[PDB]
């Protein structure tokens, strides 16, 4: 059933290998696990804030 | 797609008394929600559609208001006929998602069950496998468990449980609770017990057995 | 009076079709959306589709998205649900109801529900193993034998004492579904104990979707 | 043993036109399919294989898709190079077949031939036999024919015919049709006639003449 | 860079046999089918065998079972075809060409065909026979004049007019097989009508097999 890639270095653009990475996001109706960095900013020291 | 969650999971209250069941959406579903009830061996029935709309065919008792986010259902006065499980429908964004669904008991007076135990017959070991088998008839309430213990330890990923639907006057019901072990187990231990617990058990039901007994 | 009437329902091996229909009196299509719900046995309800009667268009829940495709017919007042590519995993009792609007609203009236089953094991007519009452003293002074019905498809069966005489002090299990590919469900009957030496006691399984029956004498054992 | 129907036998379309071509299998073929294209006097170039798989150093131009049972070898649009005979092949079953091939034409402007009858001459006769030669010179497209009439009357079973290729840049072709004779059947007719049709003749050219003419 | 290469194509009388054989380069040979097809002229493709390189077995066309043995060598990284006893019928440009497995792929290179002719004529130079242009009004005031160049074996013959010199306005047949076992092909040139009594129109019929050529001048005839 599987057979290799005819990953040649002589093939043009639409034969090269390319990796991808999809990232996905799951969100149900539970706790987020994937949590805790709600927006932070920097510090500014001397003035009012 | 919004999803539903219904509480309390299980309502107890006697025949006469106000119940309340409430909804909460994850997101805004405007008003169309729907509260049905559902009774053992039967569909669904609606009894209110859009959050506020009565169906028709259903009795004046249910009822149901919103505050916020929080959808409130109440049915005014219980009766003898209203012992059902209940749910509710978000028809807003689609996939249109139901909640969990809850339960609601009768409060009748609280009493241990009638307990059998089945040994592993010489026919059912023909199999080259043993069951035994624990039998809790006609008790009350809906909650029980059967811990089971094999020369005298307490047992665990060894038993698989079937509990049955309650009865439509006093709502009892019967748990039935087993032992898997290959033939070949069965003959390494000499005593099985069946331990049962629950609310109307003073003391937890104690039924044993030695291998090879009945 | 306002009448759902659903029809069709049936069994379907995989890779079938199967079609529902639901006709509607009392009232017309026409303003109207209408929807089917499926309730898979053991479960909760799911949505799985919509159509606008005045509209012609339809949503699907994302689930059933190119398996299950929804219609509506204003000229017979009636609406349909197309099931292809169907599966075990689809088996479920199906609902016809209607809404106003594509949304937003509620679901006002429901029918009752057709049931579809399907299974590794297509179908099979039940069997039945005894259960022995103890020989301990029990509390009432009350006993009971009883039985399993095992090995049966599809569901519903319907369990009874004595060869169908005996309904009192009967208690029945509903069935579940097992690693067979059949269904299975335990029943017992309550009496003073003296009376389980005297009253014959026979299960009666009676299995009308394979067209058989099971009488089973269940009778105390030594012990 | 699978049989393969391609169809159309010839497709004519322009330079930056979008071209389809399929084929049918018999039976089923599973994803055993391939097409391929071929230019005069060169191998044929894999373009597709398993279906929808390009292959490596085709155009991206080409791609393919299957509905219920029917493959389709599809052009995005035509470039001057994409002008060949197109195949189709499956290797699902033994014996393996190939189709019977699409010819693809540049779809230039339409135009009739030049037209000369050479009637057998005295000195051709010399061999007993006798042949009438009709041709049709620099035309376009690449079908055409010749209906013979011998007194008036349509001739059938005595002719032969063969066409030039097309030319590398106005794909013209010239186009034979003979007739053949043995001399005593030549003296057994009074007027041979050659009927010219194609797409670019609205009126079909007739050149005929009488035994012993040239 | 992947290639093949076939050879041992040739003229061998009925009766007789040939080898062909196909050597390949930028890839191996174990693991893949090496297949040959014919190719008669004039005719589409037919496949004749395949064989499995890791395997040792093969497979046949119907249309050529007992006549062609197919066989594969991978210490060469070569091929054969052993073709016996040959007719008049087997004649064919014959290829190699790659698939995988066993089978259920179809082929992905190929070679570009070496040409086998066996008829009942083993050779012969061409002879031309002229003809006349046409004597009345033409469409675009053009006219040609051509020949027919006959009964030579085997094909190829390279057709030009005024001895080679003239190209302008040359159409040829590709060659047909007739009754003789000799082949044959029609050419012209067309040229304004005024140029066919001014200009020079020899069929020059190069047929290098044979080591002769035939120089014909066509020329317009009264009628």
């Known amino acids: 059933p599987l057979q290799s890639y005819g990953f040649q270095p002589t093939n043009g653009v639409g034969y090269q290998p390319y990796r991808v990475v999809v990232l996905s996001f799951e969100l149900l109706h539970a706790p987020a696990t994937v949590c805790g960095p709600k927006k932070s900013t920097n510090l500014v020291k001397n003035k009012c804030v | 797609d919004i999803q539903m969650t219904q509480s309390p999971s299980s309502l107890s209250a006697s025949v006469g008394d106000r119940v309340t069941i409430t909804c909460?959406?994850?997101?805004?579903?405007?008003?169309?929600?729907?509260?049905y009830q559902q009774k053992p061996g039967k569909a669904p029935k609606l009894?209110?559609?859009?959050?506020?709309?009565?169906?028709s065919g259903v009795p004046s008792r249910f009822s149901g208001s919103r505050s916020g986010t929080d959808f409130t259902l109440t049915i005014s006065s219980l009766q003898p006929e209203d012992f059902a499980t209940y749910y509710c429908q978000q028809s807003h964004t689609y996939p249109i998602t139901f909640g969990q669904g809850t339960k609601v008991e009768i409060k009748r007076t609280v009493a241990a069950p009638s307990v059998f135990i089945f040994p592993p017959s010489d026919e059912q070991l023909k199999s080259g496998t043993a069951s035994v088998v624990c039998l809790l008839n006609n008790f009350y309430p809906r909650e029980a468990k059967v811990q089971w213990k094999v020369d005298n330890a307490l047992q665990s990923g060894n038993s698989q449980e079937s509990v049955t639907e309650q009865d439509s006057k006093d709502s009892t019901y019967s748990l039935s609770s087993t032992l898997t072990l290959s033939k070949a187990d069965y003959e390494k231990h000499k005593v099985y017990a069946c331990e049962v617990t629950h609310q109307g058990l003073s003391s937890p039901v104690t039924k044993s057995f030695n291998r090879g007994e009945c | 009076e306002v009448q759902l009437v659903e029809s069709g329902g049936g069994l379907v091996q995989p890779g079938g079709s199967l079609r529902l229909s639901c006709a509607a009196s009392g009232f017309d299509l026409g303003g109207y959306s209408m929807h089917w719900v499926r309730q898979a046995p053991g479960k909760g309800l799911e949505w799985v589709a919509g159509i606008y009667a005045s509209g012609g268009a339809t949503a699907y829940a994302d689930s059933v998205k190119g398996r299950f495709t929804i219609s509506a017919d204003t000229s017979k007042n009636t609406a349909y649900l197309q099931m292809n590519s169907l599966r075990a995993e689809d088996t479920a009792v199906?609902?016809?109801?209607?809404?106003?609007?594509?949304?937003?609203?509620?679901?006002?009236?429901?029918?009752?529900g057709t049931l579809v089953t399907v299974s590794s094991a297509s179908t099979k007519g039940p069997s039945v193993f005894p259960l022995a009452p103890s020989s301990k003293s029990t509390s009432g002074g009350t006993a009971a034998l009883g039985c399993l019905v095992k090995d049966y498809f599809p569901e519903p069966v319907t369990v009874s004492w004595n060869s169908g005489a005996l309904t009192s002090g009967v208690h029945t299990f509903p069935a579940v579904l097992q690693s067979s590919g059949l269904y299975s469900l335990s029943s017992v009957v309550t009496v003073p104990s003296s009376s389980l030496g005297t009253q014959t006691y026979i299960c009666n399984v009676n299995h009308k979707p394979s067209n058989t029956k099971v009488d089973k004498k269940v009778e105390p054992k030594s012990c | 043993d699978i049989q393969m129907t391609q169809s159309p036998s010839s497709l004519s379309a322009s330079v930056g036109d979008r071209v389809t071509i399929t084929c049918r299998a018999s039976?089923?073929?599973?994803?055993?399919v391939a097409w391929y294209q071929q230019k005069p006097g060169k191998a044929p170039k894999l373009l597709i294989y398993?279906?929808?798989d390009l292959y490596s150093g085709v155009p991206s131009r080409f791609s393919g898709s299957r509905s219920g049972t029917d493959f389709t070898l599809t052009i995005s649009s035509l470039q001057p190079e994409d002008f060949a005979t197109y195949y189709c092949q499956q290797s699902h079953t033994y014996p393996i077949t190939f189709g019977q091939g699409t010819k693809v034409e540049i779809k230039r402007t339409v135009a009739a031939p030049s037209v000369f009858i050479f009637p057998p001459s005295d000195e051709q006769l010399k061999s007993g036999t006798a042949s009438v030669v009709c041709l049709l010179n620099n035309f376009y497209p690449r079908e055409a024919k010749v209906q013979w009439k011998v007194d008036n009357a349509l001739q059938s079973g005595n002719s032969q015919e063969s066409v030039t290729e097309q030319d590398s840049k106005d794909s013209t072709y010239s186009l034979s049709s003979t007739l053949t004779l043995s001399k005593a059947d030549y003296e057994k007719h009074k007027v041979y006639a050659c009927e010219v049709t194609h797409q670019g003749l609205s009126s079909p050219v007739t050149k005929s003449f009488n035994r012993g003419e040239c | 860079e992947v290639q093949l290469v076939e050879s041992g194509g040739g003229l061998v009388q009925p009766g007789g046999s040939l080898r062909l054989s196909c050597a390949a380069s930028g890839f191996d040979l174990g693991g893949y089918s090496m297949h040959w097809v014919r190719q008669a002229p004039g005719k589409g493709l037919e496949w004749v065998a395949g064989i499995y390189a890791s395997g040792g077995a093969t497979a046949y066309a119907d249309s050529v079972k007992g006549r062609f043995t197919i066989s594969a060598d991978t210490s060469k990284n070569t091929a054969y075809l052993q073709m016996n006893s040959l007719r008049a019928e087997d004649t064919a440009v014959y290829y190699c060409?790659?698939?995988?497995?066993?089978?259920?792929?179809?082929?992905?290179?190929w070679g570009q065909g070496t040409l086998v002719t066996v008829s009942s004529a083993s050779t012969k130079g061409p002879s031309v026979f002229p003809l006349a242009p046409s004597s009345k009004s033409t469409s675009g005031g053009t006219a040609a004049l051509g020949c027919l160049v006959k009964d030579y074996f085997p094909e190829p013959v390279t057709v030009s007019w005024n001895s080679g010199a003239l190209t302008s306005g040359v159409h040829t047949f590709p060659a047909v097989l007739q009754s003789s076992g000799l082949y044959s092909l029609s050419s012209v040139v067309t040229v304004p009508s005024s140029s066919l009594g001014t200009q020079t129109y020899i069929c020059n019929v190069n047929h290098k097999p044979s080591n002769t050529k035939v120089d014909k001048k066509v020329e317009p005839k009264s009628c």
């Open positions: 398993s279906a929808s």
């Open positions: 060409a790659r698939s995988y497995y066993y089978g259920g792929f179809g082929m992905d290179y």
């Open positions: 039976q089923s073929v599973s994803s055993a």
